[PDB]
Amino acid sequence: VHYLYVRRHAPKIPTPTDSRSLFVTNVPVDSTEAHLRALVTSLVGTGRFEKVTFEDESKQEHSLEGKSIIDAAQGSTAVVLLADEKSVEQVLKAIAKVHKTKKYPVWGGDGLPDSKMPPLGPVWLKSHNRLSFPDPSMLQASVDAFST
Amino acid sequence: TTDHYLLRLFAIAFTKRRPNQIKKTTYAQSSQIRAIRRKMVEIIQREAASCTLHQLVSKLIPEVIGREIEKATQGIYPLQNVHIRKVKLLKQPKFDLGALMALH
Amino acid sequence: RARAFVLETEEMLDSVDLDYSEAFDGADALLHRLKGSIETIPAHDAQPLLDAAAKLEKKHKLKVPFPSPPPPQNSNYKVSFATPAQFNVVGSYVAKTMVRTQSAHGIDMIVVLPESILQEKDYLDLRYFYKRAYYLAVVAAHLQKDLKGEATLSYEYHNGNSLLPVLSVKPNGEKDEDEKKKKKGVLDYRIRIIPCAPESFFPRQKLHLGAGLVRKHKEGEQQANGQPATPATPFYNSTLVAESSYLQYLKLLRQTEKKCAAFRNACILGRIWLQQRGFGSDVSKGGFGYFEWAVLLALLLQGGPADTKGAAPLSPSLSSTQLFKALIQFLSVTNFAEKPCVLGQAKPDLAGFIENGPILWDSARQLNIAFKMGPWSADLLHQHARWTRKLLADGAVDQFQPTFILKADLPTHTYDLVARMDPEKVSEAAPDKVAHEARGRHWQVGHKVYRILRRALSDKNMEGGERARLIHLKVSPGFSSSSWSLNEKPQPQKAGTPIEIGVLFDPLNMARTVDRGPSAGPSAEEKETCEKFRRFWGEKSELRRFGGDTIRETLVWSAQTPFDLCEEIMRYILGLHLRVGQLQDDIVFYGRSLPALLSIKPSDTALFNVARKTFTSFERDLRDLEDLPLRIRHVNPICPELRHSSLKTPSFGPSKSGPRPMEVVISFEASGKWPESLIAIQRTKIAFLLMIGRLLERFKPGEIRTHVGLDDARYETENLAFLDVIYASGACFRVRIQADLEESLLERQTKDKTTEQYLRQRASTQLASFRRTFVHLPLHTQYITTATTRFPALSPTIRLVKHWFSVHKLSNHFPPELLELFVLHTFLAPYPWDVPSSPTTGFLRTLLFLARWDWRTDPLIIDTLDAWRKLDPGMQHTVLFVATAHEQSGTMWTSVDGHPRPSKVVAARMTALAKSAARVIREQGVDLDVRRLFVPSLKEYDVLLYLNTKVLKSALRTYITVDPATEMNGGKGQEIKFKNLAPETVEPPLPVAQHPVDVLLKQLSAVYDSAAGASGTGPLVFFRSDTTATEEGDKVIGAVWNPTLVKRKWRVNLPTSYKPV
C-alpha cells in the first residue's frame, strides 16, 4: 500500500500562481495529472482538478539529483492545484475521510489500489528516439524562433 | 608545436598604401615597425603553438595566418599583404608510423 | 634520494638484523661440539671398491655414487679415510653478513681432506670425486655412530650441483642452552657438512675450462692441432677447482670485507635482491647467489673498468647504497650479466674489462664463477639490472618496496610439458651419447630444449635487424628435489620430468605472421641447411618473396583468436625435436567478446578502418572543406574507438552498440556573437549544427544520413544537442560544438547563488563534468593513442578489465577514464613487474594491484592530495585518487561522477572482488576454473530483480556484431551483414533495436538514490548486455539501501519511499 503525505500549502502562499494548493510528499510512481484527476474523482464529494506543478520527479528508482532542480540558464514533492476554495475544502474533507478509513468499521481494505503505468518497450524506445532523432520540424522552428 | 617539432616561420609583410591619399611615400616610423613585428611574432606564436603539424599545414594552405596578422595589425599600421614566406622544420624527434599512416 | 635510501636501508637492517644470543651460544656451542666430534672420528685404512661395498652393505649408511658409479673393471685406485686435516667455515657466518631469513639458511662447514691420500692423476676419470664420496660416507657414518641417533641428518647437494654430495644436519628440538637448537631459524636451521680438496693439488692449467678431464675415447682424439678433439667439460672442471679453491675465496672475501666498511650491508642488500628475484647460487636458477654477489663486489672493488682503473663509485670507504647501486649499474651495462655470455669477460686483480670470450674468470685460481650461469638466467640478470638501474637512477618516487617479481620466467603462458625420457634411444629425437654425458652435468636435456626454444622463437629481418618473438626464456624442472635420504645412492624419482616453459615476449613481434629465414642464393648456404632452418623445420619451410624485392626461405603463420603462433611453434617443435611429449597451456582469456568481420579475430584493423579511416574519409575532410558563416577550427574524436579501449572493437554497422555513437568535440574560431545565456548559446550551437546537417544532406554525400539529438548525461542542461551521423559504412558519430565561453559561463554559475549555500558542490560537479567531457577527453584520447601505439597489450588489457567490470556490474558507477588510467598505471609504471606483453599477464597484474591497493594512504599518480585527504578522512566521497601531469587534482574522474562510497557499495565490492579473485588465483591456480573469476556472486544485495527482455533468438549478439550463442549458425564466417541493417526509418524500427535494461537502468539511476542504490548491466560505460545475456550472465538490478536509512524524523528534504510509525 502506497501512503501519501498531504498538507495544505495555504500557510505559505505569497505568490499568485500557487494558491488553493496541496503540498504532497511521497507521491506514487509515474504519478501524472490523469492519475491525480482519477484520484480526486475516486474521492467522493470532490470537485475538479487543474494541474500538477513541480512534478520534476525524484523517487521511483536511483540518482544523484533530479532533472531540472536548478535553473542553469538564469525532495520528490507534488504541488496539487485545485480550482476553487470549495473544491480544495471538499478534497481536504474527503482525504481526511480516507485517512480515517484505516480503522473503518467494515475493514481497512476500502482504499484505492494504486494502478501504475507500466513503462512499455515502445515508449521506452520513443524516449530513445527522443535521444537520437527528435522531430527536425519542431527543432528548426524552435531554433529559428529563438534565433530571431 | 605539440609533436615536439621545432620549426622556424619567416613571415614578410608589405605596408598598405591607403586609398584617398596624395603622399607618395607610405613609410612607417621605426617604433611602429617594431610594434608591428612584435604583434606579428605574438600572432604567429599564438596560432602556431596551439596546434599540431597537420593542423599547422592545414592552416598554411589557405593562408589563415597572414589574414589574422592583417586583421590584428591594421590598427597599428595597415599592411598591404602578409605572407609566410618560409617554414623550415629543423628537428624531427619521432618516427611514429602510426601517425604517418594516419596522415596517409 | 641518497639520504632517503640510507635511512630506509638502516631501518631495513634494523628489521632484518640478528641476535647475538642466537649466534653465541647456539651456533658456536654446537660448532665446538661437532668440531670435537669430527676430531674424535678415527681414521680408516686403504680399501678398494669391493672392500668399500663389503663395509657399507651391512650398514644403514650407504655411499653416494653420482652418475656414473665406478665399476671394479675401471676403479684401479684404493680409497681410505684419514683424520680430517682442516675444519673451517664458508658461507656468511664468519663474515657476519647474515640477516633474518624466515625460510632457511645453511652455514657451510668445510672438511678439507689431507694431501697424502690422493694421487696426482686423481683429477682425471672421476677418481677424486668418488674418493670424496667414500670419505663423506665414512664421516657421516661415524657421525651417526657418535651422535647415537638424536639429531636429524639428511643428504643434500651443495647448491643442487650433481657432482658435490654433502650432508645436512637439522636440529630436532630446542632448549635454553643445551645441544638442541631448533628455535633459531637462520644460522641454526641447518648446518652443511661438505668434504673439500686442499689448495693447488691438481694442475690448475689442467683445470682450465678448455680441457676435458674425463677420457672416454682415444682413437681420433689426437692429431687435431692441440686439444679441440677432447670435449672440454666446463662444469666438472669448475666443480673440481671450486672445491679446491673454496678456502682461498673465503680469504679473498675476508680481506675485501676488512677493506670496505659497508661491504657487509652491500651483500645484505644484494641477498635481498636475489631472494626477491628468485635467483640464487643453485644450479637450477643460474648460480648467481650470495657468494657470486660477494665475489662480484670484490672484483668490482679491485677494478672492473677497461684501463684497470679502480671503479669510480666503489671506493672502499663508501656506503652500502653506493656499493649496491654501483654493482647494479655494472651488472646493467658493462661486462657482468649478458656480455659474459656474448661479448665480454672479466679478470681478477688487477681487475679489467676484456671484450672477448664468455667467462667470469679468476686466473690466480683458474676458475670460472659463471659455470652455473647459463645464457637465459644471464640475460634475465641483464634485464633486471638494467631496469633496476633505471629505477635507482630515477629521483622522484620512493622505490624500496619495488623489488622485482619473476614474471619473465612465470608468465600466463607457462607451458606444462609432460615428456618421458625412457628409453632414451626411442623417447628422444636427439641422442644422449658419451660426449654429451661428459660435457653436460645432467642438465643436458634442459640445455638442448633451451637452445631449441631459442632457435624456434628467433626471427631475423633482411636489414640485419635481429628481433625475436621472445626476449627471455626459462625452462624449469618442476618438482625437483634437492634432498634425498641416507639410504639411497642417487636421488630416486619415478614421476618423470615436468618442464615449465616461461617466456617474456617481444610484443611487436609476438604476432608477426612470417617466420623469416636467410636469403636463398643459387646454392643453399650453411645457415639455410643448418639446425635453424630447412632441416630443423621440415615441411613448414617455404620460399616467400616479400615486398622488399628479396626472396627468402620463410615460414608463414595464420592468425587465430584463442592462442598464438608461439603455441603453434612450441607444440610443433617440441613434438618434433624433443619427442611427442605433451604440451598444455589452456588459459582462456582470448575468448572475450569476439567481433563480426572477415578472418576473425582481426588485428589492429577494425580500430583503424572502421572508425578512424571512415572518419577521415568522408567525415573530417567534408566538414573541413564545407563553407559556413564561421569557419571550422578543430575536430577531435574523443572515443575509445580512437584510443584503442572499446570493450568490443568497432565493426561496420552496429547502431545497437554502446560505444558506437562516437563522441566528437568540435571547436570553431574566436567570435563574440555567441550570447551570454546558456540557452541562447546552445540553441545557436544547434543552429550551426543545423546548417551543417543541411549542407551534408544537400551534398552528393547525401547518402550519409544525419540527425540531431539531445543529451542527458550532462545534468540540468536541456539544450545539449549533438549531430549523430551515420556514414554509408554504418559508421555512427556524435558531433558537438565547443566554444571558449562555456567554461567561464559555468564559472559564473558556480560563482552566483551564494545565498542559498547548498548548491556549490553540484555547481562544481557540473563544471568539472563539462571539463571532463569537452577538453580532458580530447587530451585523454590523444595521449592514450600515443601510448597505446608503444604499448600493444594495453588494448586487450583494457578490454579484459572492462569485461570483468561488466560481468561484476561495476563500470556504470565507474567511468572508463579510470579503467584506462589503472591499466595505464600497470603498463607505464609497471614496477616491480615487467611491461606485460601478454593480455592475461596485464589483467592479472591489474587484479593483483587492486587486491593490494590500500586506497587509504597510497594514491595512484602515473607518468603519461594532502588537502582532499584531510578534508575526507573517512572517504565517503572518493575511493581512488589517480593523478597525472594531465590532471593533477585527482578529482576529474571520481568526485565528479560522485560515487556512493561507504563500506557496502560498488567500490568496496570492486576491491573485495579484487582480493577474492587474487585469493582464488592463489589457492586454485590457473585452470579452467577462471569462470569463477568471471561469474559474479550476487551476494550481499538487498533486493535483486531478474530482468530478461523482449527479444528474439540470437539477439542482441548478432547485431552488436558479437558471436556467442551458436543458435546463430556460421559465426565463424561472414553470414551476418549490416547493409540491410542500415534502416529505412530513423524513427522506429531503428530505436526498436535498443535493449530495455540500459535506459531502464539509466532513468532508474536518474530518479532516486537518496533511499537506495543498485548495480546492473545497463549503464556500464561503452557496454551493452549482449555477452551477459548468455551463460556468462543475466540481467539484474541489485539494490542496497543506503546506511543513512534505518529510521528518521519526518522532514520535507527526506526523499525516500517511507511509511509512518
DSSP C641: T
Q: Which of residues 15-54 of A touch C (CB under 8 A)?
A: 25-26
Indicate the SS3 state at residue C220: coil
DSSP state of C81: E
CB contact under 8 A, B102 and C612: yes
Query: By C-alpha distance, which of C978, C972, C964, C983 is closest to C1025?
Result: C964
- CA–CA separation, C405 and C744 (whole Å): 49
**β partners of residue C79:** C47
CB–CB contact C684 A119 (8 Å): no
Residues β-bridged to residue C738: C667
- Using the beta-carbon criterion (under 8 Å), do A133 and C990 form an inter-chain contact? yes
DSSP state string for A61-115: S--SS-SSSS-S----EEEEEESSHHHHHHHHHHHHHHHHGGG-SS-GGGSPP--
> Which residue type sits at C461?
N
Q: Which partners does chain B have (≥3 C-beta pairs < 8 Å)?
A: C
Q: Which of C559, C555, C586 is nearest to C572 (CA)?
A: C555
**Contact yes or no for A147 and C683 at CB 8 A:** yes
Residue that the C-alpha cell 620512493 belongs to: C398
Rounded Cα distance, C207 and C124, in Å? 10
Resolution in angstroms for this experimental structure? 4.0
User: Rounded to a whole number, what is the distance in Å from the CA of C716 to chain A's nearest CA?
Assistant: 5
Q: Which of A26, A69, A139 sits opposite C708 (nearest CB)?
A: A139
Is residue C689 within 8 A of residue C735, CB to CB? The reply is yes
C-proximal residues of B, 68-87, CB under 8 Å: none
d(CA A43, CA C487): 100
Q: Is A69 on the interface with C (CB under 8 A)?
A: yes
- Is the distance from CB of C182 to CB of C174 less than 8 angstroms? yes
3 state DSSP class of C228: coil
The answer to whether C878 touches C901, Cβ cutoff 8 Å, is yes
Q: What is the DSSP string of B12-76?
A: EEEEP--SS---S-----HHHHHHHHHHHHHHHHHTTSSS-HHHHHHHHTTTHHHHHHHHHHTTT
Q: Give the C-alpha separation, C229 to C672, whole Å.
A: 91
CA distance C136 to C743: 84
Distance, in Å, from the CA atom of C801 to the CA atom of C1021, rounded to the nearest integer, reads 12
Which residues, at least 6 apart from C947, have a Cβ–Cβ distance to it below 8 Å? C996, C997, C1000, C1016, C1034, C1035, C1036, C1037
**Integer Cα distance of C486 and C146 in angstroms:** 16
Give the relative orientation of helices C246-259 and C263-277 as an angle to the nearest 10 degrees. Answer: 120
Chain B hits for C785, CB-CB cut-off 8 Å, are 98
| 3-state secondary structure at position C514 | strand
Alpha-carbon span C144 to C32, nearest angstrom: 17
Query: Is B84:B63 a contact under the CB 8 Å cutoff?
Result: yes
DSSP string, C536-591: HHGGG-EEEE-TTS-EEEEEE----SSS-HHHHHHHHHIIIII-S-EEE-----S-
What are residue C389's phi and psi, to 5 degrees?
A: -65, -40
Site from A4, A7, A26, A64 to mutate, C interface, most C CB atoms within 10 angstroms: A64
Reading the block at residue C339, the C-alpha cell is 656480455
> Any idea which residue has 668445510 for its cell?
C110
Q: What residues have CB less than 8 Å from B65, skipping those under 6 apart?
A: B11, B43, B44, B47, B48, B59, B82, B84
Is residue C749 within 8 A of residue C763, CB to CB? The reply is: yes
Q: Give the ranges where C791-905 is alpha helix by DSSP (H).
A: 794-807, 816-828, 839-852, 868-871
Mark residue C149 as left, alpha or beta (left: phi above 0; alpha: psi -120 to 50; beta: remaining). Answer: left
Tell me if C409 sits within 8 A of C472, measured CB to CB. Answer: yes
Task: Say how far apart CA C22 and CA C20 lie, in whole Å.
Answer: 5
CB of C977 closer than 8 Å to CB of C673: no
Q: Do chains A and B touch (3 or more CB pairs under 8 A)?
A: no
Judge whether B103 is closer than 8 Å to chain C, CB to CB. Answer: no
Residues in C closer than 8 angstroms to B102, CB to CB, are: 612, 616
- Paired with C705 in beta bridges are C726
Distance CA C289, CA B53 (A): 53
d(Cα C407, Cα C827) in Å, to the nearest integer?
Answer: 14
Q: What are phi and psi of C163, to 5 degrees?
A: -105, 10
Experimental technique: cryo-EM
CA–CA separation, B12 vs B32, rounded Å? 15
A3 touching C (Cβ < 8 Å): yes
Q: What is d(CA C386, CA C331) in angstroms, rounded to the nearest whole number?
A: 8
Contact of C476 with C285, CB cutoff 8 Å: no
Q: Residue length, chain C?
A: 1061
Cell matching residue C973: 564466417
State how far the Cα of B35 lies from the Cα of A46, in Å rounded to an integer. 82
CB-count exposure of residue A135 (10 Å: 0-12, 13-18, 19+): exposed
CA distance C331 to C384: 9
Distances (CA, A) of C834 to B35, C256, C511: 56, 35, 19
Q: What is the dihedral of CA C23, C29, C33, C36, to 10 degrees?
A: 90
Instruction: Identify whether the C-beta of residue C1022 lies closer than 8 Å to the C-beta of residue C647.
Output: yes
Long-range contacts from C89-95, C-beta under 8 angstroms, 24+ separation: C89/C31, C89/C250, C90/C194, C90/C246, C90/C247, C90/C249, C90/C250, C91/C192, C92/C267, C92/C290, C93/C27, C93/C187, C94/C250, C94/C254, C95/C253, C95/C254, C95/C257, C95/C264, C95/C267, C95/C294
A129: nearest CB among C949, C991, C1059 = C991
CA distance C196 to C132: 8
**Three-class SS of C1037-1055:** EEEEECCCCCCCCCCCCCC
Put simply, whether C786 touches B (Cβ < 8 Å) is: yes
Chain A hits for C1011, CB-CB cut-off 8 Å, are 59
Instruction: Indicate yes or no: CB of A143 within 8 angstroms of CB of C686.
Output: yes
Contact C789 B96 (CB under 8 A): yes
- The set of cell numbers assigned to C324 is 649496491
**B50 contact C CB<8A:** no
